[PDB]
């Protein structure tokens, strides 16, 4: 996690980096199916290694609270 | 690093060269403008009244 930051920057700064990157690298359910093989390819870009589905999402998560809203309305 | 002698060693750039128009080594090969006769800047020849005393 933020252990690469050593004893620098302080709690918060490297506390959020940990979580953000933690929820960032988890196995995500692919939209083009339901597999947990989605990985980030860069800022806001995700791809499912299973079916090769490359798509747009949040900067650190594949879906955002606002993105999940579009669906509804 | 001193601005004097040690900084003089880095000078190996060619800027002013012999001008095709006037023959003076004043044609800036980077600007392609002669600082002596104005070649590359003006068709007219570079001239100024301050190149001599006012009443002469």
């Amino acid at each position: 996690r933020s252990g690469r930051f050593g004893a620098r920057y302080g709690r918060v700064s490297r506390r959020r980096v940990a979580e953000i990157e933690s929820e960032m690298n988890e196995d995500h359910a692919c939209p083009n199916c339901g597999e947990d093989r989605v990985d980030r390819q860069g800022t806001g870009i995700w791809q499912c290694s299973y079916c090769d589905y490359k798509f747009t999402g949040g900067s650190y998560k594949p879906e955002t609270p606002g993105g999940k809203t579009v669906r509804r309305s | 690093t001193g601005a004097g002698t040690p900084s003089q060693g880095k000078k190996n750039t060619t800027t002013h060269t012999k001008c095709r128009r006037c023959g003076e080594k004043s044609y800036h090969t980077k600007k392609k403008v002669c600082s002596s006769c104005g070649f590359g800047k003006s068709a007219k020849r570079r001239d100024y009244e301050w190149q001599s005393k006012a009443g002469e």
Partner: protein
């Protein structure tokens, strides 16, 4: 004294210019005669240097290959539509008039056909509220109610890359890299830390502005610094 940094900026010298020769493309909506008979397929998702957000390359029916301001949830293979009769789905563009009320939109045109001006930044969106035959009411990201011509085109959904702002830069070096992709001079030296000759706040034994910071709107350039025409300051009240 000497011109302040804000004044050096305006001359548009290299130091203050944006790395335009490195920018990818102008994400303006397509121009359709009419009919909406224009559809394309998302051929790829790319990184947009100028916005730190992703953009999508689309191949349209008539052979036109162009980058588009992508909303969240768009992927390769997906089909997008642009026109009056376009379908009401994420990633599709059509005039506000055709958009159902209560639908989040992005890259909204200011004047019909301008290509899009509003809500284009990471994870943002305008909210189409009211319809009409003469005026479409949109709620922009800043919370402002904007009256627009119903003929103003827009894209359904929110902009991709949301949350970008939720993570701290942590290091000066990270700010550094981002700044190198913008038309901005960075880092920032405080006015109070300069010599009197360089800024209204410069000079003095210890650092401190030797004057109130709230400056008048009518102040000339060179003097308009600090808190410009502030209606108020602080957190109190």
């Amino acid at each position: 004294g000497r011109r302040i940094q804000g004044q050096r900026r305006g001359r548009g010298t290299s130091t203050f210019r944006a790395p335009s020769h490195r920018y990818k493309a102008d994400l303006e909506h397509r121009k359709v005669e009419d009919g909406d008979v224009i559809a394309g397929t998302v051929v790829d998702i790319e990184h947009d240097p100028a916005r730190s957000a992703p953009v999508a390359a689309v191949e349209f029916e008539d052979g036109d290959r162009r980058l588009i301001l992508a909303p969240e949830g768009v992927g390769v293979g997906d089909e997008l539509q642009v026109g009056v009769s376009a379908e009401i789905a994420p990633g599709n563009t059509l005039p506000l008039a055709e958009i159902p009320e209560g639908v989040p939109v992005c890259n909204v045109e200011s004047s019909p056909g301008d290509g899009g001006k509003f809500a284009r930044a990471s994870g943002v969106n305008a909210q189409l509220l009211t319809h009409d035959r003469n005026v479409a009411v949109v709620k922009l990201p800043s919370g402002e109610m904007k009256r627009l011509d119903p003929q103003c085109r827009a894209t359904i959904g929110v902009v991709a890359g949301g949350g970008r702002t939720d993570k701290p830069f942590v290091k000066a070096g990270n700010k550094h890299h981002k700044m190198k992709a913008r038309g901005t001079k960075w880092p920032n030296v405080r006015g109070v830390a300069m010599n009197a000759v360089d800024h209204p706040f410069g000079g003095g034994g210890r650092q401190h502005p030797g004057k109130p910071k709230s400056i008048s709107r009518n102040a000339p350039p060179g003097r308009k610094v600090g808190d410009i025409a502030s209606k108020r300051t602080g957190r109190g009240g």
